[PDB]
Amino acid sequence: GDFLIHHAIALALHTTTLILVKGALDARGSKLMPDKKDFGYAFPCDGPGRGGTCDISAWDAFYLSMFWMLNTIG
Amino acid sequence: DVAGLTPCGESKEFARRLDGSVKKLQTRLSKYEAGTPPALALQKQIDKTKNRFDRYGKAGLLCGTDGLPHLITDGRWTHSGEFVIPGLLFLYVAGWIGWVGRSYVLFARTADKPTEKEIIIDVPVALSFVSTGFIWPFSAFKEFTSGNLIVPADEITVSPR
Amino acid sequence: MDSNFLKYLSTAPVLFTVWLSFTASFIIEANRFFPDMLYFPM
Amino acid sequence: DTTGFSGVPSQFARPESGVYPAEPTEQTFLGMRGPRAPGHRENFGGKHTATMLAIAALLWQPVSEAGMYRMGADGALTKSSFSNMEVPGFGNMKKAPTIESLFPFAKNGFDASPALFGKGSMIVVEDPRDGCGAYANSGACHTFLDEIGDALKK
Amino acid sequence: EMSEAIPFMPKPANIDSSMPGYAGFDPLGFTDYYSAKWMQEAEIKHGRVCMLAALGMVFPEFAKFPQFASFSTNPLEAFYQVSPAGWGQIFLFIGVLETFSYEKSFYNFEGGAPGALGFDPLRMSSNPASAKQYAAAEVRNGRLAMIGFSGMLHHAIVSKQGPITQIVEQNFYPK
Amino acid sequence: DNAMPFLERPPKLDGSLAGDVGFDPVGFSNYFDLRWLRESELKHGRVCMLGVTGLLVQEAVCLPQFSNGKTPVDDFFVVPAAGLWQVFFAIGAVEFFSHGFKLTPGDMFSEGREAGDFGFDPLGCGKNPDALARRRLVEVKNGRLAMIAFGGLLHQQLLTGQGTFEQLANFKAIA
Amino acid sequence: AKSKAVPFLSQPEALDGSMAGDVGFDPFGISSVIDIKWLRESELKHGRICMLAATGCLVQEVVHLPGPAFSQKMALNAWAAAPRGGMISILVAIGLIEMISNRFALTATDMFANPNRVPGDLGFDPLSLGANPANRARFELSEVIHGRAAMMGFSGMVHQMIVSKQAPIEQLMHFKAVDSSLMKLGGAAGNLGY
Amino acid sequence: AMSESVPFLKKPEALDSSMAGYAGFDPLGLSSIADIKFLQESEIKHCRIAMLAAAGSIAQDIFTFPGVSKVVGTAKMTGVHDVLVKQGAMGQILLWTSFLEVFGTIALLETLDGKRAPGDFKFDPLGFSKNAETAKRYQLSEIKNGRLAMLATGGMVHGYFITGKGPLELLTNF
Ligand code: CLA
Ligand code: CLA
Ligand code: CLA
Ligand code: CLA
Ligand SMILES: CCCCCCCCCCCCCCCC(=O)OC[C@H](COP(=O)(O)OC[C@@H](O)CO)OC(=O)CCCCCCCCCCCCCCC
Ligand SMILES: CC1=C(C#C/C(C)=C/C=C/C(C)=C/C=C/C=C(C)/C=C/C=C(\C)C#CC2=C(C)C[C@@H](O)CC2(C)C)C(C)(C)C[C@H](O)C1
Ligand SMILES: CC1=C(C#C/C(C)=C/C=C/C(C)=C/C=C/C=C(C)/C=C/C=C(\C)C#CC2=C(C)C[C@@H](O)CC2(C)C)C(C)(C)C[C@H](O)C1
Ligand SMILES: CC1=C(C#C/C(C)=C/C=C/C(C)=C/C=C/C=C(C)/C=C/C=C(\C)C#CC2=C(C)C[C@@H](O)CC2(C)C)C(C)(C)C[C@H](O)C1
């Protein structure tokens, strides 16, 4: 039982790290917003064009990793 | 034994697991007449339950204090049939599926309409690829060393940063 | 057999449904004849 | 297009060598036909391969009978393993490896022969007919032809 | 041009007759991706270590050093019977010998021949025919020792004894 | 003449070497160097002449410092281990010095020696050329004879266990 | 332009009467989907395996190697009795034979990459028995036919060993008819399981 | 061109009268299957071994070498084989004939090269084949007698497998 939960805790540590690292490393730019750094840290989106850009900011990866942080400490 | 565990063939808690599992089925069988279909169904389940417990006891599995089999996965050879060999079996199938899928996506790139080959699969050619997967470790490593698995970093699109 | 009907059966959802039904089916059959395989027998 | 299982690597967008040697016609007795080096079939051809097998089969006869043959008081010969030859000057190793370690027939209980099958461990040739005929049998022997006769008369 | 070792395959492009143990044998083209001279240096070092290792697995069958006379003749148990001070001294000595390869590889990689650590005290390889023969013989005895040690190691795993002992007792198969 | 008249004569066996009767059915000298094969043949032959002399002598004579085996082949097993090892290393010293430290088929003949010559004629028996030719033929044929004879003497001494002359004076067939 | 084997069907393309044993039999049209070269390679291989296998069953009934591990007249019992180490030796040797005789052109995409490669022709003629080009066509025909017949014959022998727990020749010499009180076909879903 | 021995069959297209013992007898076409020089060498080998075997059967029935009756008792024909395998008699015969057969192998491979007539080991210590007409006649006599002795050997050993008598004793009794 302790083996299984530690691997769940490992899953949640790597997944929270993933969202946060992806937020840090794509903060300056990505392929959707190559100029993402001109808009700041917390901006809503770049609009519905190019397929849709909801939660594209680096702040939004903080937002998404907060759910995974709560899940892991749970 | 290993990690203070007990072989399932001499675990008393394993023995009580088998008995309780059969008493539970026998009291359901006590409510049916001999030749009925519910009696034969439960008599076949008592045979299956006993067979499983017998096989586990004689297999070299180790039981805990709870009387359930535990798997040793540290790499020791006396326990390689619990993870290392099932894992070797898995990776052979997984690399086969990967090699075969990769071979078809490269074929479809040289097609008249490359995206039509991926929603309408050329089944004779895709079956030609699935048969090739049996020697994927040799085929994929030779693919690697011949400079055809890995593309260089400067032919891959990256984000500006 | 009609080539447009065979081109229909070569579509991704049909092959996906058939292959994974065939795949599921020999796992089911393997667990009928050889049940309760927690370990590779060795 | 590509037919499927065609076998040509250029039809499946697979990298080929581009090198496809011409297939010769010369053969060797215990080897195969195919591209060889120049002069290879002249030194390692049928003449080489047949001769080497002939020497290997001749030298098998001492090896299949390998042992320490010693006479007793009369002319009677006793057979022993070559392990009984204790070499004198190799420290802690006193029993040495011999030709019986590369050909350990005895350990597997083989009883090799210079004709490869000795009096003990001989080929077993039985008769499957079990001492009766094809048709019109009586007793514990009922052939398929008898079963056809039994069905036709019933 | 086709490979000598595997006559129906084409010749591996990055190995050459210049190399002492050349047979044209690279079915998986390691030299097509890795440096052929790095691979050449690695094969020679593995062979030199294995040539000593093959003698070492065999030699305490005959005689042991008086201090380790009590130690076992199965090599896989004599490994653990040696004290960590002894293994530390071995590791330090191999480290001192490996400083010369750390200086040859990684600094003057292109100056010399693979495996040439400046160790020719008896001045062999002076005669060119002898040098040619020794180059090829070192490679072939190194490859043979690699195979032979690999055998003897796994044989000590199965039968808990050494090579000669397994042969003498005819313990050739898993009991 | 041709030793095997039905077989074609081997192409590399010209008459220049002594003892050549055109006998090479298996087909050596078509793969190996005839200089190496001839030097090997003389070495085997001269060793076996000394070997048959040793068998006959040791059946009778015994040095006082040594025990005596039942047979000259059991004479090997009562000579101290150090003595056998000293003889082995002494012969090895001779093999190194007489062959100019060139001992392999790749380098033994790269200085231009004729097969079997070590410049050994203290009594000067090979002073005459034609007499040298006759004694070359004598040497190779007596050497070949001593090879077979040594095989016979050793295997009979192993089998009976009663020497060579003792065996003849007490002949006892296989029973 | 109708098939000769099946007169009411059209003659299949990729079957032109060149190959030995070609009589126009491909009703399901596999030759139109799968290259005939691969199909003939696989047919010759299956047939060669089955010639050995049918002969294996019959001779194994009659003649045995010495020892108790080789004393199984019933050939299906020999599978279990024969030393496992040597059986896996056979398997490994077969794999080595498969890679070398095919010259590392093993797969559906690289066998026949050499235009010189011919279906079923591995270069195997140790005694040069196919040296005469006059016998070539009838050898090819009778190899294909022996292979087909032995596929059918071995299939029958295996499933007659399953039904009757008897070796093939002594099943013919001690025949017993099928009672049908055992080995009923199917039925896993008729009784809803168990 | 039709066969001299089997008139309704064709000439076997690999056999020619320059061969010794030719009668056009290859109805099964084996001379087309195997290389003919190999077949010729095999026939003469089978011929000579069977000639020795038939003569040996006859002579062993007539007399027996000194001391042999001790080791070989009621055993005769094939029966003596297992008793003399225990002894080294058959081992020694096998050793020396195998030694000769290594050189026989080299000779056959030269024959297949085409440098030697089949069965020609050049063995004529006493002089019989000096003359060419005598040489050809003896070639035919050797082939014919060897063929007869092959069938003879067959009959003799099978007569032992039936009655246990031996050739001469089967003539004397029944
Ligand atoms: C350099 C000249 C030289 C010297 C000084 C020696 C000295 C010796 N030899 Mg001799 N030997 C030599 C050359 C020499 N050897 C040559 C050239 C040959 C071959 C032609 C031999 C063949 C020979 C035989 C056949 C025997 C000896 C033995 C002995 C030793 C007897 C000691 C004993 O009883 O207890 C010592 C007991 C021990 C267990 C200790 C081992 C002996 C030590 C290691 C001797 C070391 C000598 C040294 C390595 C010189 C050899 C050089 C090499 C080229 C031969 C003695 C020290 C006898 C012997 O060793 O019996 C025991 C014996 O049977 N020798
Ligand atoms: C056979 C085709 C194929 C191959 C060779 C790969 C190869 C890879 N993928 Mg996968 N991928 C595939 C299909 C394939 N992908 C498909 C169809 C999807 C959509 C679900 C994905 C989604 C996906 C994600 C989200 C990720 C990868 C990752 C990876 C990498 C690591 C292996 C892994 O995590 O597997 C994981 C595989 C999956 C999660 C899904 C695979 C689903 C099936 C089994 C494969 C498709 C079979 C296909 C229909 C083949 C038909 C062949 C036939 C026509 C002949 C590696 C580059 C990971 C990566 O980048 O790490 C470095 C990663 O994060 N892939
Ligand atoms: C340290 C010893 C030593 C060394 C370095 C050599 C070196 C050589 N020998 Mg010599 N040889 C030796 C000892 C040695 N010999 C002895 C003791 C004998 C028996 C008297 C011979 C008999 C011999 C013959 C007959 C032939 C050679 C040949 C060769 C050459 C080929 C290299 C090779 O493959 O063998 C290298 C050999 C070794 C590393 C060890 C040799 C040991 C052999 C197997 C003899 C084993 C011992 C013997 C049965 C019993 C001796 C008892 C005695 C010690 C009391 C090379 C010049 C061949 C040659 O030059 O022709 C081309 C050849 O035909 N050798
Ligand atoms: C790497 C070489 C090698 C080695 C060292 C061994 C070693 C062994 N084998 Mg193995 N074997 C090998 C290769 C090898 N095998 C290969 C390549 C095959 C597949 C063709 C086999 C198939 C095999 C079987 C089926 C058996 C063995 C057995 C044995 C063991 C007992 C041997 C014995 O008593 O022999 C002494 C006995 C003999 C020499 C009698 C030989 C009988 C004749 C020669 C068989 C006829 C051969 C037949 C015509 C095959 C033709 C096909 C082939 C050319 C491809 C021994 C451990 C036996 C075993 O597991 O015992 C426990 C066993 O039953 N072997
Ligand atoms: C080129 C090779 C040619 C091969 C020919 C095959 C010969 C043997 C075929 C069966 C012989 C007679 C059958 C009567 C036997 C029979 O019909 O039994 C009936 C059985 C179902 O049981 P029931 O519902 O009939 O139970 C009836 C009650 O009376 C008893 O409970 O049918 C099956 O489903 C069994 C076959 C498995 C079906 C799936 C097979 C595996 C699928 C693999 C992919 C497809 C392959 C082809 C599938 C058809
Ligand atoms: C460089 C240099 C020089 C030097 C030097 C030195 C120290 C050279 C050292 C050379 C050495 C130690 C060579 C050893 C090679 C060992 C081999 C090939 C063994 C293979 C084992 C096998 C095949 C096996 C096996 C086994 C198997 C698996 C199954 C077993 O049941 C049995 C069995 C035993 C048969 C000097 C000093 C002269 C100076 C010069 O100026 C420069
Ligand atoms: C690759 C492939 C093909 C294929 C194929 C197939 C199916 C090939 C199968 C081949 C087989 C079955 C080979 C069997 C070999 C048996 C051996 C060597 C027995 C050795 C006995 C020994 C050593 C012993 C012993 C002894 C012991 C231990 C103790 C004693 O008490 C008993 C005894 C005395 C006997 C083909 C060619 C068809 C086509 C195509 O190209 C693809
Ligand atoms: C190629 C080549 C050469 C070669 C070679 C070799 C090894 C050639 C061997 C060829 C063989 C083994 C051919 C065997 C064919 C068997 C058949 C057709 C059986 C069919 C059975 C049937 C129909 C049945 C049945 C049955 C049923 C089901 C009911 C049963 O109750 C009974 C029953 C038995 C009646 C060599 C190596 C010499 C070299 C050369 O240079 C090249």
Automatic annotation (TrEMBL), chain B:
InterPro entries: PSI_PsaF, PSI_PsaF_sf
Family: Belongs to the PsaF family.
Disulfide bonds: 8-63
Keywords associated with the record: Chloroplast, Membrane, Photosynthesis, Photosystem I, Plastid, Signal, Transmembrane, Transmembrane helix
Cellular-component GO terms for this entry: photosystem I reaction center
Record field: transmembrane: 83-107, 119-139
Originating gene: psaF
Pfam families the record matches: PSI_PsaF
Any one biological process term the GO annotation gives: photosynthesis
Source species of the chain: Rhodomonas salina (Pyrenomonas salina)
Protein name per its UniProtKB record: Photosystem I reaction center subunit III
Residues noted as binding chlorophyll a in the record, renumbered to the chain: 74, 77
Role: Participates in efficiency of electron transfer from plastocyanin to P700 (or cytochrome c553 in algae and cyanobacteria). This plastocyanin-docking protein contributes to the specific association of plastocyanin to PSI.
